[PDB]
């Protein structure tokens, strides 16, 4: 019964780990896009 529970917890954490990598990659892309947005504003502000 204990071995089964341990196997379940391992399976659960592997799934939690997948969620965190997905989240991390998402925030990485968003940060890159905010940098791109800042560059666009600064380069777009020149004439105006």
């Amino acid at each position: 019964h204990l071995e089964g529970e341990v196997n379940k917890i391992k399976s659960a954490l592997l799934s939690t780990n997948k969620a965190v990598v997905s989240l991390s990659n998402g925030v990485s892309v968003l940060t890159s896009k905010v940098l791109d947005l800042k560059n666009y504003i600064d380069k777009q502000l020149l004439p105006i």
Partner: protein, 35 residues
């Protein structure tokens, strides 16, 4: 030059990725709830 279509596509993809993250946690919670 910042592509407006690409910008929306990429951020909407991030939102899709976050829903995937939530789905992985639901799976983890269900497994733990079975213990």
């Amino acid at each position: 030059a910042l592509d407006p279509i690409d910008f929306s596509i990429v951020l909407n993809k991030i939102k899709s990725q976050l829903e995937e993250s939530k789905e992985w946690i639901r799976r983890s919670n269900k497994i733990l709830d079975s213990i």
